[model samples]
Target: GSPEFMELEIRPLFLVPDTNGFIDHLASLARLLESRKYILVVPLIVINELDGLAKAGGYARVVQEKARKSIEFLEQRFESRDSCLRALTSRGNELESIAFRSEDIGNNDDLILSCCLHYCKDKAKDFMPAEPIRLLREVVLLTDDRNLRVKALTRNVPVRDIPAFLTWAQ
Candidate 1:
């Protein structure tokens, strides 16, 4: 039998600086996914952002180091890229698609959303749950000339809500 859910995309906000609560949150998510046997789709964009932070120097160094270490941990757990990809592909045509959107704003997030939308549209028989997929869409945004925190909020994708939204995983 197939699993109840499909893929999950972690947005950039979850990976940014001041992720005190995020580490625990992600650990819980990982355990939940492992228990339910769900495949998570990691957006390349998130990795790119981490790389940028690592290269930024100065205040970013601490966060960069943590992020790098976290990536190493995840890589070790997942084994290899092929192993992770295999999990997603296991559900055959019924798997839901998830992807990361860049925080470049303007239309970057829109593009990522469009990709998922199109995938769902094309594979309606798979019954991709709209709510879970829309979670990322509602939170991921780009800000213009807003306050720093406001901009952060604006560009924030509510990754913290994942555990709650997927209550059965808890």
Candidate 2:
């Protein structure tokens, strides 16, 4: 491993609003993205989930709109979407190839888990932070769902809720 491999970046398994708070915590999306302090992998499935929620009625829409706003704010403010966020999708047949399913049965969470696992096993493991960084490359999943957290843990994906992550990060 290169000296650059040793960094403490929080590679969060982002689930919509559950991980939306990242926007508020970072000094700037540019700094975080440039430094790798917040690497949120938004699976395409989660995007659909978010869209469905954002299109809903009543307070539900408000909650989801706030999350959408956080994302939109990032997109609007940043010149490089690639630097701040990365949307992940399965290669044709790759999802079916994954044998591990979350105990939650048939749900996007299962696919999310598989996606997270895929990244964990990714060989290309690039950790360029534009310059030198002394952070540990610890992959952790940020989830509000207790079940998803459990599933992620079983597969060796470290999991943490937002508040707990904030405490630990600071």
Candidate 3:
């Protein structure tokens, strides 16, 4: 073994879950995140998708019901606060309404991937050049969509399915 060994410290986590993550596992998320700084970063595209799904026709009753509940939960948590500074100051664990760049165009999955890349690239820079090389926050994309996970991995973003994420929580 070398004289110098690198030991990694646990860093705070920033979880960016996609629309499916919310629709499928919103209850788990709501109950679980109550960690190592378990901040929930919600992309605007995901919200939009949820909004559409919540109002969809009778073809997808199960999806529509879950989507409606998820939106209601989010609204109760964040939107219930006052419109003043309390709105900004209270929500430390949730970041909502994150949109992809204007030039970035694709379906909801692609936009969700864009949000993950945004955190991995943009938010990561905030702690990269510290004096003591502090540990960076773990920005994870929670989704059950196989194609989206593949695309996220190709772009160097971290991906986790709902079950895996739940196990990680344990």
- Candidates' TM-scores? 0.42, 0.57, 0.67
List where candidate 1 sits over 4 angstroms from the true fold: 1-24, 56-59, 78-108, 123-160
Tell me model 3's lDDT, rounded to 2 decimals: 0.61
Give a tens-digit lDDT track for model 1, residues 8-94: 343422111112212334564455336544444433333344445545566576677766664554555555343332111212222
How many pairs collide in each candidate, listed in order?
0, 5, 0
Residue 8 shift from truth in candidate 1, angstroms: 17
* Sliding window of 10 residues with minimal summed lDDT for model 3: 82-91
- Which candidate would rank higher by TM-score, 2 or 3? 3
**In angstroms, what RMSD does candidate 2 have relative to the true structure?**
10.2
Candidate 3: segments with Cα more than 4 A from true spot? 1-12, 56-59, 80-105, 122-137
lDDT of 2 by residue, 1-170 (tens): 35443433544533222333343333333344454656655555654554445457787766676657654554454434444356555431222111222222246777677656655553343444555543332456666678888997677677766566655655
Per residue, candidate 3 scores C-alpha lDDT tens digits across 1-170 of 33432222334266777777877798777754553237676666667778878874565998999998987777766654412101111112234322231222267666666666655443445445524444333667778878988997676676778678778778
Per-model CA lDDT versus the true structure: 0.37, 0.51, 0.61
How much is 82 displaced in model 1, in angstroms? 7.4
